């Protein structure tokens, strides 16, 4: 029955991390027709308004959204990565990448300038392998990343497959 | 394990109709954090541009959207339902309801004038009950439908449960 196949999907979903859930949600959106996408667009808007109207999330959401699209902030995190706190900085990059807005070239470039350094550091095992794969997962399906950017990045994906 | 959990979910989904897919996707969005909602917002804005850029689905998508929000199209359809073609008109309404834009009061009014007539018709077995149950399902979680609207529609929902 439906409430039983829905409960199965909800259970496996809550067994997924935020990257995993977002990637699958992107896959499922591909199995939908226009009316459904439009309905979900309006629904995400309501959820976003609610999230920004409560202290449990409002400040946390505004700052991450701005930081993720702020070339000055990102350049400083890159500058800080080369030296240390690489792992922590990559977690921050993984949490901000989903918010990168299509058309923000200034910020996209900084992002695409760190992934190579992150890939090289996983091959020396300076940083965890799963984190860079999670970041790469987003880059492959990201609405802000062009096919041209993905070509320049394939030279780094093989090392992760 | 992950690719497998995803293949399970994906299969249960493709075994679902559009209304079940849209309602489940709505519930899963409530289990996402802000960065994920933004990614999916930008992602749909690509999949939507995708549909409106390919003959396969561009025209049909543009038309059902205008029709679902055009009081002149909707009024003319209500005037034709009363008489006949109820099942086909009800199917058209179900296909169009998800595209009702929040703030479109003129269009919303006509949708809410037809729902009573259709619940009465399902009780006299003039129309299939499944269709009306799917219409009320969208109405219960619809961003364009207010709490007031819901309370005014509660008398007709009891009969459907």
């Amino acid at each position: 029955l439906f409430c039983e196949q829905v409960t199965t999907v909800t259970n496996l979903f809550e067994k997924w991390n935020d990257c995993e859930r977002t990637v699958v949600m992107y896959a499922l959106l591909k199995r939908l027709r226009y009316p459904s996408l439009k309905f979900l667009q309006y629904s995400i808007d309501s959820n976003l308004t609610q999230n920004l109207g409560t202290s449990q999330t409002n400040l946390s959401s505004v700052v991450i959204d701005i930081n993720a699209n702020n070339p000055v902030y990102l350049q400083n995190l890159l500058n800080a990565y080369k030296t240390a706190r690489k792992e922590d900085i990559l977690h921050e990059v993984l949490n901000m990448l989903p918010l990168l807005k299509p058309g923000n070239e200034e910020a996209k470039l900084i992002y695409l300038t760190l992934i190579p350094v992150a890939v090289k550091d996983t091959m020396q095992q300076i940083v965890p392998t799963e984190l860079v794969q999670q970041i790469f997962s987003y880059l492959l399906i990201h609405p802000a990343i062009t096919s041209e950017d993905r070509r320049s990045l394939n030279i780094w994906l093989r090392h992760l497959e | 394990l992950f690719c497998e959990q995803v293949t399970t979910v994906t299969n249960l989904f493709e075994k679902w109709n559009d209304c079940e897919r849209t309602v489940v996707m709505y519930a899963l969005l409530k289990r996402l954090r802000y960065p994920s909602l933004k990614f999916l917002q930008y992602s749909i804005d690509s999949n939507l541009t995708q549909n409106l850029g390919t003959s396969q689905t561009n025209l049909s998508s543009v038309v059902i959207d205008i029709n679902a929000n055009n009081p002149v199209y909707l009024q003319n359809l209500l005037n034709a339902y009363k008489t006949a073609r109820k099942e086909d008109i009800l199917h058209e309404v179900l296909n169009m309801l998800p595209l009702l834009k929040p703030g479109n009061e003129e269009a919303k009014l006509i949708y809410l004038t037809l729902i009573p007539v259709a619940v009465k018709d399902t009780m006299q077995q003039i129309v299939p009950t499944e269709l009306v149950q799917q219409i009320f399902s969208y109405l219960l979680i619809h961003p364009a439908i207010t709490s007031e609207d819901r309370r005014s529609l509660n008398i007709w929902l009891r009969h459907l449960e």
């Binding site: 990257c19 995993e20 990637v23 992107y26 896959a27 591909k30 392998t129 799963e130 794969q133 999670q134 790469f136 997962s137 987003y138 492959l140 399906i141 993905r150 994906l157 992760l160 497959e161 | 394990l1 992950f2 690719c3 995803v6």
Partner: peptide, 14 residues
């Protein structure tokens, strides 16, 4: 497909 490529990386990372 790039989405398939992404699920493989996400597979490995679990």
């Amino acid at each position: 497909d790039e989405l398939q490529q992404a699920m493989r990386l996400l597979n490995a990372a679990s």
